Each structure stands twice: as structure tokens, then as C-alpha cells.
Write a protein that binds this ligand. Structure first.
Ligand SMILES: *[C@@H]1O[C@H](CO)[C@@H](O)[C@H](O)[C@H]1NC(C)=O
Ligand SMILES: *[C@@H]1O[C@H](CO)[C@@H](O)[C@H](O)[C@H]1NC(C)=O
Ligand SMILES: *[C@@H]1O[C@H](CO)[C@@H](O)[C@H](O)[C@H]1NC(C)=O
Ligand SMILES: *[C@@H]1O[C@H](CO)[C@@H](O)[C@H](O)[C@H]1NC(C)=O
Ligand SMILES: *[C@@H]1O[C@H](CO)[C@@H](O)[C@H](O)[C@H]1NC(C)=O
Ligand SMILES: *[C@@H]1O[C@H](CO)[C@@H](O)[C@H](O)[C@H]1NC(C)=O
Lengths: 299, 49, 240, 50
């Protein structure tokens, strides 16, 4: 309205804005062995996939881009551009060689021979999949038969389940009894790779990375540089992946040697310890409130 | 007692996920991108409303 | 090389076997948590291959250092990996190697040939300060989601023939990312050599239960309520 | 198009036939067809490209 009567009215709200940003990360100086996972010159078959675990190091993903112009780089639980600042508990890496046209079979909620009999991913998968061509490396002129894949299995595979049993498959009522006769077939089929093969059959090296969130004090994060510490000011803070805003003050809270955080009745964070220097600090929300306008009549 | 209980329940209701990946907006914003964040945000919005 | 004969017994566990669920600090609050715990007034075994189930609570009070380390494994054979925790005076050794264990392993005191015949393929090794330090030592072992968690507590106890009455919260010791299957566990003994000896311990099993824990203003757990013990405890849990 | 009714339906011969390339069920779960009860069954068979 263009006319206001005498009284008090609630119009809007206000909040104190942050001043700067504070960043604190651990002091580990190691480099995560992502290099050894790649460029290994020997990749196991899909039916027996190697599983490696990475922890207690600084993870740098620049070598990933420096490796090659990858055919496929697909991240599901996170965004590929923001892996440089996240913090994880443990990292799992699975590497193997597969056919070119079957790369699409590696994804949550997918069906296929590799999907059900060789390698299965959980529906809540939180990680990335990388696939790059390696035709010049793993293709003999006569044919490479070292890579094999399972073809027959009675039941489907659970997520992250590995099978290495090699027994003659029985497809009928009669038992094979140790011979590969009629209606009895070997479970493993050997790939044939030749340089004359076109796209869709040349070998591809695939690495699947899985991240572990919401666990014990995380360790796998050191890419971003830390900063200094300020107190008694409205500021943004990032403590080992815990991001927030507020005022940091000295704390008189008796933390036992194994706690990291602190909660209240309302179940909100109120205390935190600095990873670089063991010291307890309290966090308070910055000032906010409402604004009321007092005015007589516009007349 | 009734006022305190109602306020406590209203505050505690903020920790529900309502069928989403997380109950914290900052975690979703720092781990994802706009195109797939709205799906998670909508359920939280509906529950809080 | 068998030397030990084991005799079973039974007793009451009372209110023992409480540990910190997570590493979050709390003060002057009551918290409800559903997890694997030792039930109140459970019915534990006294011993003078044992199944592992979903977790193990171990209790000892002996000073002669005859107790040192444990063996965890499914088949106790060189075909499969197994955990071997060995505590000595200076440090502790933890390995996940497929050792060929004997029927009745025991430290010679210090050749490991009687404990196992050969060492072979494995990927994990851990060395640190030994776990061990009128005294009661309690330990809790549980293997979940690719992690072996070990909690413990050491308390001064008067001369008593049974577990004492009171509350003692077990603080976390270690969380090893092993991720292997565990079915049976065995207790290691150290006899000088072949002299006869005696040892005794208490063994109990954990079950999924809901507990109500009380935190004080210093952040230490001082009281706990088992919601499924009796209708009174159920009412207490309902009223919080 | 063939219609099946008034008989006991056994799906073991389905598995005994061959190592099928594709077996996909939408409205139900393939493992639980051994206990369900239906009114009429319709079967359509033909040859197609791979
Ligand atoms: C991997 O090894 C090759 C030689 O085998 C080397 O040229 C390359 O720099 C190494 N690192 C990467 C990231 O490819
Ligand atoms: C414990 O179990 C044994 C046998 O399983 C039983 O005889 C005994 O009464 C139970 N309770 C106590 C207190 O020993
Ligand atoms: C105790 O174990 C540690 C761990 O390897 C070892 O270094 C030390 O030599 C052992 N002590 C004796 C007396 O063997
Ligand atoms: C250990 O495991 C590897 C991997 O299969 C195997 O080749 C080897 O024979 C096993 N035994 C020893 C003593 O290395
Ligand atoms: C552990 O042992 C059980 C029984 O011996 C077996 O069924 C299981 O596959 C083994 N491995 C795992 C990872 O549970
Ligand atoms: C609680 O903490 C205060 C402050 O340090 C201390 O004086 C008091 O003795 C503590 N009470 C205990 C440990 O029961």
C-alpha cells in the first residue's frame, strides 16, 4: 500500500556477514600411491580384479589428467571438479582390462555378463570410474590370451564379491564329472586382442575408485593449502572437511585424548580441535535478528 | 513444559533426511553441482514445511 | 606338544562391558544408542577353538603375564589369513599372515615354531606400544564393515572371586582396517622351557541391544540402562 | 500368440533349455515364479536379430 497507519511493523531480518575464511588441514607430507595403481604394465583379468587400499597420505588428482586423454571419466556420488578439496577416510581402487564395448556395463543398476558374473557395483556407490584405451600395450600381433572373463555362474554376484573358482560348469541334469563333454562348458573364456581389430573390441584399462565417507577421523586429504587461525570474529572455517561459519573462541572443555567433535542437546556442533595444534575451540553462531519499523501515520 | 517440548521437537526435526543423501545443505553444495542438487533439496524443503 | 586342559564354569556378568559408541564428546546429556553390547546380567563362561559370533568380551585378572596376545581365524590353517596379536615387554606385533598354526600354540619363551610352522603371503603389519600394562583387564573385540575394533579398560579391583559391581566405560584402543572373515579365536599362553601352569579368564558374547547412557559434565559415561532387561527399564527408556 | 490355462506351471524346463542370453522380468521377480498363481498365461514367440 502507498499509505501506512500508525504502529510497528516487522519488515525483514538481518545477519552479520563473515569477514574471511580459515582453512586447517593435517600436516602429512606423503603422496598417495595413485601412480603405482596406474602405468603398472600388468593389469589382472576382470574375473580376478585387484583391490588396493589408500590411506594416510595427500591425494593429488593432477596425475589423473596428466596420464592420457581418457575415453571415460564418470563420477556418480561427487562432482569431478571438486575432488581437490574433499576429505575421505579410505580409498579403494580396482583395476582391470575389459573390452571396449562393455565399458558401459560398469555402472550402478546395470545388467550384463560382466555386471552379474564378473564385477558388480552397489546401488549406493560413491566414487568414480576411469577407462582409457591401451591398444598399443595389450594387443599382440598374433593374439593375447592372458585376459579371461567368467561366462557361466549359477547365481548373481553380490556387490564387491570376487570369485576365482575354476570348475567345469554343468548346464543340465547330468553331472560333468571332471570332463568338458556335451552340455558341459568351461566357465572362463579368453579374450582375443589383435591390432587389426576395430573399435569396440580393443582392450581398455579401467580403474574404479570408491570413497569412504562418514567414518573415524578422516586422513586422505591434503591437496589444499592450510591458512592461519583467527578468533573472536565472524569467519568461515574448514576443519578437516567440516565446513561452517561462526565465531571461534577459547574453550574450557575437557576433551579426552580420542574425541574430535562436540555436540549438545539439540545435536549441533559446538566444539572442535585444531588438527595441526591440539587445542579445543568453541564455535558460536554469528549475530542475527529481525528489524521492525516504528512510524506514525503517513498523513 | 509444553512450550519447551514443542520448541525442542521443532529443533530436533532438522536432523531428518526425508529420503535424501544427507541432512546438511553445505555437504550437498560442496560435493555436488546444481543439476542434481534440487532433487535432494526438494524433500528437505517439503519435510521442513 | 599339548599341555593344557580346560575346565568350564558359569557366573553372572552383572553390569559390565560398556564402551564409548563413537568419538563425539557430550556432557550432561542422556543418549540412546543401538549397537552391539553385552546384555545386563548376562551369563558368561569362566575358563581355567572358541566361536567368535558377533563380538567377544574378554576379562582377566592374572599378573603372571601368562596371557599375551590372541589368534583370530576361521580355519586356523595356512590356506586362509589370520590375525595374530602378540604382546611382549617392549612392543606389540599384529600380522594378518596365513600362518600354519599348530593344534595347541603357545610361546616357548621366544621361538614361534611351536605357535606356527611357516610365514607366508600377507599385506598388513602393525607395531606399537603393547596393549597390556588386584588388577582387572577388560577387552572388547568386534569385526564389522572391514574394520577390527579393539576397546579395553584397566581397573584396580579388591580381592574378589567374581566380577565387581559398578560402571566402567571402555575407551577405544585401536581400529585396524583388515576386512577379513573371523569365526574362531584362541588364547595364547607363555610357558617357560615345559613347567606346568594355570590360567583363568572370563568370556562373553555381544548382542544387538538398545542402551541409554548418561553423560556427566566432564563427558565420562557413569550410568547405563538396558531397555530390554525388564518392564521398569523399558519405562525408563520410554520416559528418557 | 498362445494361451495357457488349467494346468500346473513348472518353470524348471526354462532353465533346463539353454544358457539363455536374456531373461528379464518386469512385474515380478524371476526367483518367485514358483509360488505365484495366475489366471491366464500368454506366450508370444518369434525370431529377431541379435
Ligand atoms: C608410468 O610409467 C611410465 C613408464 O612405464 C612413465 O613414462 C610414466 O611417466 C609413469 N607415470 C604415469 C603417470 O604414466
Ligand atoms: C549360566 O549357564 C549355565 C549353563 O549354560 C547354567 O547352568 C547356569 O544356571 C547359568 N547361570 C549362571 C548364573 O551360572
Ligand atoms: C618385543 O616385540 C617387538 C616388536 O617387534 C620386538 O622388536 C622386540 O624385540 C620384542 N622383544 C623381545 C625381548 O623379543
Ligand atoms: C601366497 O599367495 C600368493 C598369491 O596367490 C601365491 O602365489 C603364493 O603361492 C602363496 N604362498 C606363498 C608362500 O607365497
Ligand atoms: C568366512 O568364512 C565363512 C564360513 O567359513 C564363509 O562363508 C565366508 O565366505 C568367508 N569369508 C567372508 C568374507 O565372510
Ligand atoms: C569434573 O571436572 C572438574 C574440572 O576439572 C574436576 O574438578 C572434577 O573433579 C571432575 N569430577 C569428576 C572427575 O568426577
Amino acid at each position: 500500500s502507498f499509505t501506512v497507519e500508525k504502529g510497528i511493523y516487522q519488515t525483514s531480518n538481518f545477519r552479520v556477514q563473515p569477514t574471511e575464511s580459515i582453512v586447517r588441514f593435517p600436516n602429512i607430507t606423503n603422496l598417495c600411491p595413485f601412480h603405482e595403481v596406474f602405468n603398472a604394465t600388468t593389469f589382472a583379468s576382470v574375473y580376478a580384479w585387484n583391490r588396493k587400499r589408500i590411506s594416510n597420505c595427500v591425494a593429488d588428482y593432477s596425475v589423473i589428467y596428466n596420464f592420457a586423454p581418457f575415453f571415460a571419466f564418470k563420477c556418480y556420488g561427487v562432482s569431478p571438479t571438486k575432488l581437490n578439496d574433499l576429505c575421505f577416510t579410505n580409498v579403494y581402487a580396482d583395476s582391470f582390462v575389459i573390452r571396449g564395448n562393455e565399458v558401459s556395463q560398469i555402472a550402478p543398476g546395470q545388467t550384463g555378463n560382466i555386471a552379474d558374473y564378473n564385477y558388480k557395483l552397489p546401488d549406493d556407490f560413491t566414487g568414480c570410474v576411469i577407462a582409457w584405451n591401451s591398444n598399443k600395450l595389450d594387443s599382440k600381433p598374433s593374439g593375447n590370451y592372458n585376459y579371461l572373463y567368467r561366462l557361466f555362474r549359477k547365481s548373481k554376484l553380490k556387490p564387491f564379491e570376487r570369485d576365482i573358482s575354476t570348475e567345469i560348469y554343468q548346464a543340465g541334469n547330468k553331472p560333468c564329472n571332471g570332463v568338458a563333454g556335451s552340455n558341459c562348458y568351461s566357465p572362463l573364456q579368453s579374450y582375443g586382442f589383435r591390432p587389426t581389430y576395430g573399435v569396440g573390441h580393443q582392450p581398455y584399462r579401467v580403474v574404479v575408485l570408491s570413497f569412504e565417507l562418514l567414518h573415524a577421523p578422516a586422513t586422505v586429504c591434503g591437496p589444499k593449502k592450510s591458512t592461519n587461525l583467527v578468533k573472536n570474529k565472524c569467519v568461515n572455517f574448514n576443519f578437516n572437511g567440516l565446513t561452517g561459519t561462526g565465531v571461534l573462541t577459547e574453550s574450557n572443555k575437557k576433551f579426552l585424548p580420542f574425541q574430535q567433535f562436540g555436540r549438545d542437546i539439540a545435536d549441533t556442533t559446538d566444539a572442535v580441535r585444531d588438527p595441526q595444534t591440539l587445542e579445543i575451540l568453541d564455535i558460536t553462531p554469528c549475530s542475527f535478528g529481525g528489524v521492525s519499523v516504528i512510524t506514525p501515520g503517513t498523513n | 513444559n509444553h512450550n519447551a517440548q514443542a520448541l525442542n521437537t521443532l529443533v530436533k526435526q532438522l536432523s531428518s533426511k526425508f529420503g535424501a543423501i544427507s541432512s546438511v545443505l553445505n555437504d550437498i553444495l560442496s560435493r555436488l553441482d546444481p543439476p542434481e542438487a534440487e532433487v535432494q533439496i526438494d524433500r528437505l524443503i517439503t519435510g521442513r514445511l | 606338544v599339548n599341555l593344557i586342559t580346560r575346565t568350564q564354569s558359569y557366573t553372572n556378568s552383572f553390569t559390565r562391558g560398556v564402551y564409548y559408541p563413537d568419538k563425539v564428546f557430550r556432557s550432561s546429556v542422556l543418549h540412546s544408542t543401538q549397537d552391539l553390547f553385552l546384555p545386563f546380567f548376562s551369563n558368561v563362561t569362566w575358563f581355567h577353538a572358541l566361536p567368535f559370533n558377533d563380538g567377544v568380551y574378554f576379562a582377566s585378572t592374572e599378573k603372571s603375564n601368562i596371557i599375551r596376545g590372541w589368534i583370530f581365524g576361521t580355519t586356523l590353517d595356512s590356506k586362509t589369513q589370520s590375525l595374530l596379536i602378540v604382546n611382549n615387554a617392549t612392543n606389540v606385533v599384529i600380522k594378518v599372515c596365513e600362518f600354519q598354526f599348530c593344534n595347541d600354540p603357545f610361546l616357548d619363551v621366544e621361538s614361534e615354531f611351536r605357535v606356527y610352522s611357516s610365514a607366508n603371503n600377507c599385506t598388513f603389519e602393525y607395531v606399537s606400544q603393547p596393549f597390556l600394562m588386584k588388577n582387572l583387564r577388560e577387552f572388547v573385540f568386534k569385526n564389522i564393515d572391514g574394520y577390527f575394533k579393539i576397546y579395553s579398560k584397566h581397573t584396580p579391583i579388591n580381592l574378589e572371586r567374581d566380577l565387581p559391581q559398578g560402571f566402567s566405560a571402555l575407551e577405544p584402543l585401536v581400529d585396524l582396517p583388515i576386512g577379513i572373515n573371523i569365526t574362531r579365536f584362541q588364547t595364547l599362553l607363555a610357558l617357560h622351557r615345559w613347567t606346568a601352569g594355570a590360567a583363568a579368564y572370563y568370556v562373553g558374547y555381544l548382542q544387538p541391544r538398545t542402551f541409554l547412557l548418561k553423560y556427566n559434565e566432564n563427558g565420562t559415561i557413569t550410568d547405563a540402562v538396558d531397555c530390554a532387561l525388564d518392564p521398569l527399564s523399558e519405562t525408563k527408556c520410554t520416559l528418557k
